[PDB]
Amino acid sequence: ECCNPACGRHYSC
């Protein structure tokens, strides 16, 4: 979840 793969859609964590 954590910026996966790299905060593309600015994922949570």
3-state SS of 1-13 is CCCCCCCCCCCCC
Q: Which method was used?
A: NMR
Residue pair 2/9 in contact (Cβ under 8 Å)? The answer is no
Distance of alpha carbon 5 from alpha carbon 13, whole angstroms: 12
Tokens of 12: 């949570």
Tokens of 8: 């593309």
Q: Any residues with CB less than 8 A from the CB of 4 and at least 6 apart, and which? A: 11
Residue pair 4/11 in contact (Cβ under 8 Å)? The answer is yes
Distance of alpha carbon 6 from alpha carbon 8, whole angstroms: 5
Q: Tokens 């905060």 — which residue? A: 7
Tokens of 3: 């910026």
